[PDB]
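Example complex used in Figure S2.
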Amino acid sequence: FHCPCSPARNYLYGLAAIGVPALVLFIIGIILNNHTWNLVAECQHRRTKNCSAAPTFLLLSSILGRAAVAPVTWSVISLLRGEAYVCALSEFVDPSSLTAREEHFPSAHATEILARFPCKENPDNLSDFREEVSRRLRYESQLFGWLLIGVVAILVFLTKCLKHYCSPLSYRQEAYWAQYRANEDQLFQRTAEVHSRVLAANNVRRFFGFVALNKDDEELIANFPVEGTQPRPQWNAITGVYLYRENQGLPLYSRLHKWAQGL
Amino acid sequence: FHCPCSPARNYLYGLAAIGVPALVLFIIGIILNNHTWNLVAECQHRRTKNCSAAPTFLLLSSILGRAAVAPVTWSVISLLRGEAYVCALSEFVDPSSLTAREEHFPSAHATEILARFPCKENPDNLSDFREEVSRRLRYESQLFGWLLIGVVAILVFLTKCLKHYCSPLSYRQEAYWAQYRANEDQLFQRTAEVHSRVLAANNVRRFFGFVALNKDDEELIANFPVEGTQPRPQWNAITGVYLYRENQGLPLYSRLHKWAQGL
Amino acid sequence: FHCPCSPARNYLYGLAAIGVPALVLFIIGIILNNHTWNLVAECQHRRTKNCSAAPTFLLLSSILGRAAVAPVTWSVISLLRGEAYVCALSEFVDPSSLTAREEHFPSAHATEILARFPCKENPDNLSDFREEVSRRLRYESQLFGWLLIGVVAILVFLTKCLKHYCSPLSYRQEAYWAQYRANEDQLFQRTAEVHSRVLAANNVRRFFGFVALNKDDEELIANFPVEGTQPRPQWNAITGVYLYRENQGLPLYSRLHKWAQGL
Amino acid sequence: FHCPCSPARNYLYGLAAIGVPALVLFIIGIILNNHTWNLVAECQHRRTKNCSAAPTFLLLSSILGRAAVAPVTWSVISLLRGEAYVCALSEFVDPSSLTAREEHFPSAHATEILARFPCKENPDNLSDFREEVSRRLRYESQLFGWLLIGVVAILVFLTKCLKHYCSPLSYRQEAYWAQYRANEDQLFQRTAEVHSRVLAANNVRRFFGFVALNKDDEELIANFPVEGTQPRPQWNAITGVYLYRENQGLPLYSRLHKWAQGL
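Predicted assembly (1052 residues):
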């Protein structure tokens, strides 16, 4: 942050350099993760089963949750240090009503001096106004910073009590279901890695006559032999957002876990 | 902390920067822990057994206890250092009655000088008032800090003697019941982790044909085989705040321990 | 970056030294990689099967993707530091309308002074214009830099949602197909290395009478004996861009995997 | 680089010290390598089989490729630093048209001052011309440097797409043939070393009565016994540039690999 000194551009850089890189870190927070493409894939084809993404409230809360842990931490760091609106508030400082400061403000040369304070463009004659612009800037920016942690914390406390109203299940079952879905997509990424390598090694060997494996890959084809035959519908019946249902007395904790009960 | 220098805003920053971040660390102290969602889950559905959260006094004391170990430590650190109300008390300093200081206070230019002391906005002419504003500020803020440890300690001593009046049981049974509940929710979190992994590994294997386990996970499916079948009522009958009762001659130390006696 | 000071050449170096080395790192990003020569080889001969490179959208997106991870990172580093157009914007600064700066601009000696600001060629008389040229330069260049991360991130989010519309398959199958193609061309490069060494060692031995192998090469000819006989058509039927098809119920994940099903 | 200051010699050192050591590193790039003597040996005797070196385009491209990776890297390092033509361009600076600089140029004493700028031979009176000779020199030399990387990169991209037009084979066969020829001339240099030592050790032993071997040389004569008998025609039938042909259904990847098929 290095703010400018000129009117018709000065007030821009306050709201911009405090908010705009938080908005760009917001979008990168959506993209770089994994969990948003469930909703994207559950609305492109959606297999005509659920509409309007109504049971995906836990999805939408969780995707915005990680999308706000990045920029709000950056937005209060760009607020607790105090350099948010150093030349933006100064465009709205009243010329006669800025008390506790001897006004060096004439009728016409006021507002340009009001748009050149934190540029190190104020002369030494405004040393009393150095007491007054460290007054406004450091005090209100530090206060907004700890209140923004306040409004984030009260919104977390509101949405967590709301989630514990609109849930079918307990909070111990909700802790278990969260430990399930992290254990399924770790074992599914790790097995699709190994089942790809054994399918690739059968294909290279059919071309040359052999393959070139290390020691650990050699036992890996010994234990886990493949012939890749699961079609595109069986890759479609396990993609989706979530699925909490009941199989007439039993819980189903994911989209794949409804499929393995079908056999 | 960097306090401002101007009236109609100066007295704000004293009470605010001493109390408001303690209030926000208060709410984060409630949210980040585990134990408050028992009361939340025991009032959303509550299974129509207990009303008004009357036996949850030990709950409400313990949840506010951890919620006050964070900010009160921060609130006396923002009181023992002495920078709490450095420009807030100065808005209430009497112009003629501030003795042990030669008053440089005329009729109209008094109170603005009273609102610009600790900003480094006081000129050298108030060097006697540097002796007088390190008088008021460092003395009363250090005294309030060690008295706030005093009022916290006397309130701890009051509520502990009160808890030892409104308890059915001893204090050696209360030490044992506290060692029980830490040993149950450590073994319940650790077993729900393992029982999730064995349920996820059966589901991936039903899709691909095998799974991709490490060495320790391989023996883990060997020792602990699952088929997840405990319904939503049996996940509901073990959630709740506490349960001290008697099974006609025997104590029951938790909500789950009433359930295991039912079999 | 060290920008000059003279008109008819000053405005050149702004757009050039910010964009032109990004354009050259763009072409090196295309060349140095592996994946673009699939499209080149699938259009020189192309074996008269597919036309106009229509199913190669995932190819063209991926090749431009790595071709933009190099220069855009360099282009915002040459924009966040602020030295992009330091003597290029100064050729377009209005002589009378550059407010918040006392204009030392006469009728004829203006624009040459406008073309000699950041060269350290401005005298001390333009110290107010040092406040004004650190105004324009550092403010707008830092803003364009974080907006260029913005336009890159919104274009990433647009093309990823578009790719998840124009895809036949899921996103879990797309993660598996990406793990396949990295495992096939790692085992194909590694086996063509070993199958070349065993073909070269049979040729040297036929000349001298023996060969000069290390210990690891000695067991390598023991396990993997060759006689290189796969012709030029069988090296042609496995080159190509991609091939997602269906073998009437089963997926085919690469060009080689269509060939191994033919046997 | 330390450039002089006098006309009729000043403009020489610009083109010379930027280009001439690149020309000498060009010739050393041809000589020190291995691969150019194939063309030399395939034109001195050439065994009356191929004429005009027509299928050696991949040879001529590869030999100039390593012959340009050395000096072009040095030629842009002698261009990006900016000291290429510091007293060569100054011999062509126009006396009246060198704008953005107060001309201290009379009718007769101009051009000698134009030939003594970067020698530290300019007096302090040309301090404005220090702004003007760091203008011309650092700006245009840095621009030519990143454009020379540009013209090298566009010529690489042109000749690689041309090579993928004038090739009989694929690009996966071309990657395999490049792994063959590095594995053949590593095993041929290593076996001609060992087959020389066993031929030398039989000759010394026939003189003295024994030989003086280490431990590793002792087993080396045990495993690999020789009697050097391959004549000068059989050393002639394996030298040559390349040989891609077809043995009626099969590829031949080198000159030696045509010979081993003859047996």
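Chain C has one domain: 1-263. Chains C and B do not touch (no CB pair under 8 Å).
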